[PDB]
């Protein structure tokens with residue numbers, strides 16, 4: 001279900017940078033969304049503190065620069081930005097994009113002395129069912145669309161879950177599509193320079209709360 | 216320091232008591248004494264749960280109290296709450312034996328989830344009662360339908 | 374303030390056949406009779422006002438009592454009535 005996606009839109013015109021993130025030191029937990037109050041299990045990497053740290057990693061990757069000739073190459077120079085120029089945000093396939101890659105959106109909470117009516121849990125549960133939504137129907141009414149202006153399908157950014165119970169995920173998948181530039185050597189050079197810096201950053205990213213791998 | 220007692224003839228509702236009950240006023244049977252529960256709903260009283268909770272609050276150190284009432288009215292809106300603490304245990308106490316839901320509700324806001332639960336019991340901030348089935352409590356019970364209300368005590372004609 | 378003149382009341386009031394036998398009788402939801410009180414605005418709105426004014430005293434009574442469920446307020450009133458005019 002994953003290669004179908006990289007073979008329909010990306011390859012061979014787009015290369016993919018991909019990370020698998022686990023949270024080896026974090027317990028799963030159980031949450032009750034308003035108004036049904038049923039017990040919903042949430043996997044270790046869907047802990048709120050883990051998600052803020054994964055988003056720290058993801059934002060740092062977006063900020064990674066590489067030197068090439070006299071230029072500073074950014075990911076924005078070489079990335080699939082589907083809604084350019086209009087919207088220059090790089091496509092990031094990540095569970096964090098349900099919150100538009102924002103710390104404050106991730107922390108959005110509507111509650112009182114009695115209930116928590118809406119939070120990241122309920123936004124997650126809704127968004128994985130309707131990734132193209134502009135309004136999660138909750139009291140927070142937050143959108144589901146990624147910052148690049150398109151849907152993030154749950155089976156591309158999660159792993160280790162049973163059936164369609166995405167909330168049971170034990171791994172996060174983060175995918176950065178990058179232009180292959182097969183037609184263009186000079187852009188390719190710049191893309192490869194950025195890539196070398198990204199591999200090195202991610203392979204020695206120091207955070208014992210996270211286990212970051214490739215493939 | 217005295218509970219008012221309402222006296223009715225044909226339609227004369229005079230808020231009296233036995234601190235007045237004229238020597239011509241007739242109480243010949245205990246069957247003439249009735250307690251009634253009346254509902255607090257209508258204009259200016261919000262119905263959605265987020266607005267409704269603003270009338271209630273959690274408090275510790277105060278023991279819950281119950282008082283019976285014998286008749287009440289149809290309620291347009293009732294509430295039925297279930298709340299987990301952050302650690303997953305129960306926030307509201309189970310309904311004590313013999314306490315059932317308010318018996319006549321047009322509509323029940325029946326909701327469940329989790330919340331901060333910053334106290335032992337949930338009370339009414341306006342000093343009203345949570346009306347259950349012919350019992351009025353100072354407190355909210357888990358999964359049990361209530362109407363908000365107040366109680367009066369009357370002397371009915373023979 | 375705030376007054377609903379209509380009183381669509383319920384109360385308890387089956388003495389025919391085996392219906393008085395708990396096993397055969399109505400369930401908890403089915404022991405009530407209903408009625409509609411109407412164009413008695415002065416009475417009904419007066420009732421709402423009385424229940425409202427009663428609350429502070431009742432609440433203070435309940436704070437001071439140590440029994441969990443108070444059933445005896447009306448019987449106590451009846452006694453006080455008799456102690457007044459015969460004590």
Ligand SMILES: *[C@@H]1O[C@H](CO)[C@@H](O[C@@H]2O[C@H](CO)[C@@H](O)[C@H](O)[C@H]2NC(C)=O)[C@H](O)[C@H]1NC(C)=O
Pocket residue numbers: 255341342343365374375425426428
């Ligand atoms: C009895 O009726 C009065 C009058 O409506 C209610 O008083 C309100 O009390 C709250 C809190 O003390 C105030 O915020 C409102 O402004 C009051 N309304 C007024 C002054 O018109 C009182 O809550 C009622 N009691 C019960 C048990 O329902």
